[PDB]
Symmetry: D2
């Protein structure tokens, strides 16, 4: 169990940006700029800085050229400069390695703290950032698939309850989770900004980064991303979806960047900002929990995720999950899922929904 | 081969309605009225007559209680009363069984001809019909999933070129089809009303009815039908979709009624009314042909379809397809499909796309 | 009355394109290409040829540089090559001036007949056209405001019944109209292709071209056009809408090009292909007939429209409507409209809504 | 000027509900339930408690039968039970009349403080509320016009800067405002929950309630409300819109209930939760500031607004605005607006846009 520090937690506003290491900067630029339409704040031979349509901070995504594709940092904005000091004290009390740079790790961010958190994830906390032109009414630029905000991160970690307690002490509130009747937690979603999540924990070998999520205004904007991928004959890069989630109630799509970093496109979840927001627990065997329409979850969604780096830039060692596997208990050989609790009709035994089995 | 009659073809306007035999009338009413929101023109203990939001003719769907669920008639409206006489002469010259009723087979239809056509299907031709209130501006009734028009039928038949040639002589024009490089045809779509199709042929054991399709205004209306089915905890009756089709370019969904009759919800195909409208042929191995986003086609879509009746109400004997099976050549153990023609990346061998094999 | 020819009418498929004369080609190009996103089929220093997303014929719009902005031709595609000969015989019998060019008037059209029709409008009939890449699945090109098809034309003419009967003889069927209890017709919509309209008649001084209409897939695509015009700070070129029409039930928007040619963006009207399609007549005083939500129709919509050219390229003289004016009877000083017939609550007198 | 208390401000989460006095409970029910589709949490012969599709607290709207239609309370939920104590101390230091009830003023709310605030408005602060079934995935109930959240209130008050300072001290942050080149402020928007507003101030004679706003998921849902109103032949109850706002960037519609209470339908504004969120100031003569498409703002939108009650249920006396009137300066006889700053073309003198 990760103890609660005596030192006060930093006041975290929201997820703010991710820095992803990519192997071919021009290929990655083609995906995030030419395909997905993100807006360039700055670029050079080594990095691309990108932001969503409604953002006013410098960026929501930094692509950094390097030898091994991986998550380098997931960054959260805090409420005041002083909260960066609070973060440093808090993580030092937790016995974590930290690095502080008064003028930032990446361009357009000022005083910043990066940490190897207790789950092995590279987190950044910052307040100071270069404001840029907020493009929210630049409909002369607006794409039919426009990504309007950064919404969340999702992390793969072997022990979800351990992680959940640590994030709750840091001030995230769990909005939804997936459990079974035998005490296992498979996933949890938790927020600061009053949406279903700012980060989330998915049970699996880790630390690895499951995805970064961007939102659109409307469901048709997500449809258009699919449509455009078809027209560009890159439909093999659509991993899963589009769908309606059970957890979050958002309309969703998962796609894969050139280094296989998974990106979610997301819209129309609900308000969670009240402190007694009802926490929703879904049973892992409920076949509407991930896709509300019952569509099967592709096995790569459960097995594949991005490497993460330590503060030296080396890949973090993976620790195997020993708790039960969501894949195995739902769509694997001894798996089970239901449409209606207690009804054999519309249940699935040892395979996925809708007539499919694991490849 | 089906010869072209000397007698002139009737001038067919459009698909108009289907008569489906259903086993439990109240359960079918719950599906078509309470779930899907179709509008009742007439009903009693034996039949329910249903129409779409923008229709002015008496009905688009007749549910007839009977012992064996099946298609009893697929009905086309012709341009004038005299075209019914033309249909009679045309099918008599073909040597088909016909039955003429001056006062109709179903309520709200007048003089009508039913035939057991050369492919074994019960076709109706009629002009006269009782007009009803056209509900197209009744936004006090409009549902979030509103079905606005009847769009088309789709028929399963073993020999597609044989059926296509016969429908062309009837005045239907091919818009799109699916072939392989060695001369096999798997499917064809053909129209009278200037959309992608009024009826279509799917290669398979037949005669069977693959589906009846209704339109919505917008893509979100289709999404709502899925969302409603999830809320009603009947997501197991969502067979396939939602998606974007390759062929037709329509946004789509397939669902199953209580007797397993398949209903397609469909929107935003293109205009085909010019006589040199460009035909489009897709290769059967192109994994964007059916779902443009590359999502796998569930095997039941290829295997399952409704019985059809002869004019005595008995089930038509099925004739087996001898040409290659689309299922087998694409997603079966020796199947294959591609994302980009000639590229092994994004190709699938012996399984479906996205990581699934056949269940 | 325009008598019906004994010569058979050409079989008209649909409205196909318009040729608009524009005064500043580059400014017009910025509007139709950079603002509206139409696709270039051909251009040079004198003309731009444009098409919609789902089109396979060469173009839906030809912009031709000239001294005086006007409609030069409104073109209808006919079913066969022989229908061009039929059109020529038909209009000759009508006593109209005609001009046949076996190699076309504009690029990408072959054998074509232009006429000064009995209402003073320059109509073209053609079959042959150069096919181009149908862009209907080119979602790499698709705009948030994408114009997907050419839908219809709308003509201003002084005597709507006279024009209506002429168009009915040509095979157009009336789908909707606006009348009053006195028996005056203010407007009528008529089709060949099985939508509410291919060419409509608006009562007013004419011949003038009221608008050309393009369709989108969805209502949000129309919203986006408005939003883009705001961002470009050209919201003054949004004339009327967005709204829901009563007549047609379509979602709509009217905007003005750099020469004040009016373009409608339009979506989601209904199927009219059956020959007994029920005709809908609205009362001119019904405040939901034009905008279903009861928003007022600004006077410029009734009074302003494009000049049209004769076959020499000179502007056609205008004939003043003598029938009652829809503007005057609804929003002028003695006009009125209602929300509910017979209810003074929600009625407007001498005054728009 | 309203002084800043020594006492700490309550931590306000969001706007939560309004109580509206209505004169005919059945006609109001028909508007809010049958036309607009709001969900009944509770009703009896005196009151209807309504909530939006995604709400879990007891209600977002209380309709209370009474002799004079008016706003009775605009309620904000606070973060903790202790914040209701803080609210009470804060308003007492401001010298405002307060009333606290441990068991609530309306059903489904527990310990609650109502105040007559420094601008004459009846504010409620509460934490405790009865949770109900959150209908957010009840797509079996979902309307083509579904109202999904309560978004904000908008208040008419004669002196905007005076009010703005008071709300900022309470912890609201200004997101957008409208000013001119002569030192006048015409409107301001301010939030707690990280949207463009939870309440807003519109310069005018007051206290009056300008509107209550509810959100939809998508723009077509707003369109459907207009289409349904046409089908019901009540299009005369559509006041303004639908449109795109300049301020807030939201898609919008304004309609009128049977007592003329104005309801906004609203979707797709932007995130404001960062404390240095950039504040946007529009010029009052910019004809894209209220409707981005330059559609004219009807004079009733400026002149008409609901009465508000004091804690005894009596109508608050209206104080006249002496600052310049947005109506007069933009669409009055001597008004002016522009499409492009400094461009005569697309400008309007002494009349509204679009003819
Ligand atoms: O329901 N799941 O599959 C979820 C729900 C929300 C998420 O953002 C996600 O990435 C997974
Ligand atoms: O691409 N296919 O799967 C199609 C395309 C159009 C249809 O109407 C259909 O039922 C199947
Ligand atoms: O109702 N009107 O104002 C209409 C309806 C359809 C149209 O295409 C139009 O241009 C005007
Ligand atoms: O721009 N205005 O007109 C606005 C902007 C936002 C609002 O919520 C409003 O009621 C008015
Ligand atoms: Ca268990
Ligand atoms: Fe996610
Ligand atoms: Fe189909
Ligand atoms: Fe029009
Ligand atoms: Fe508002």
């Amino acid at each position: 169990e990760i103890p609660k520090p005596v030192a006060p937690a930093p006041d975290i506003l929201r997820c703010a940006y991710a820095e992803l290491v990519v192997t071919d900067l021009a290929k990655s630029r083609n995906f995030y700029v030419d395909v997905l339409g993100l807006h360039v704040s700055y670029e050079d031979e080594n990095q691309i800085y990108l932001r969503s349509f409604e953002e006013f901070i410098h960026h929501n995504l930094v692509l950094t050229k390097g030898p091994v594709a991986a998550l380098k940092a997931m960054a959260f904005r805090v409420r005041t400069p002083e909260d960066v000091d609070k973060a440093e004290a808090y993580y030092q009390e937790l016995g974590c390695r930290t690095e502080r740079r008064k003028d930032g790790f990446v361009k357009g961010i000022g005083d910043a703290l990066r940490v190897e958190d207790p789950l092995g994830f590279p987190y950044e906390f910052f307040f100071e950032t270069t404001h840029v032109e907020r493009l929210h009414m630049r409909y002369d630029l607006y794409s039919a698939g426009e990504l309007v905000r950064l919404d969340h991160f999702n992390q793969v970690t072997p022990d979800v309850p351990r992680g959940r307690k640590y994030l709750e002490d840091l001030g995230f509130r769990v909005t939804e989770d997936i459990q079974d009747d035998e005490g296992t937690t498979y996933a949890a979603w938790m927020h600061r900004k009053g949406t279903v999540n700012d980060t989330a924990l998915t049970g699996g070998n880790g630390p690895r980064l499951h995805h970064v999520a961007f939102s659109t205004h409307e469901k048709h904007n997500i449809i258009q991303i699919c449509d455009k991928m078809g027209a560009l004959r890159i439909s093999d890069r659509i991993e899963r979806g589009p769908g309606r989630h059970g957890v979050s109630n958002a309309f969703y799509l998962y796609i894969l960047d050139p280094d296989n970093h998974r990106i979610e496109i997301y819209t129309q979840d609900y308000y969670t900002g009240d402190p007694d927001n009802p926490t929703i627990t879904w049973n892992v065997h409920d076949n509407q929990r991930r896709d509300w329409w019952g569509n099967p979850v592709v096995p790569s969604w459960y097995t594949e995720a991005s490497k993460v780096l330590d503060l030296d830039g080396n890949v973090q060692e993976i620790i195997e999950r020993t708790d039960d596997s969501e894949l195995e208990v739902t769509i694997g050989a001894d798996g089970f899922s239901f449409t209606r609790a207690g009804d054999e009709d519309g249940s699935y035994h040892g395979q996925a929904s809708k007539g499919f089995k694991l490849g």
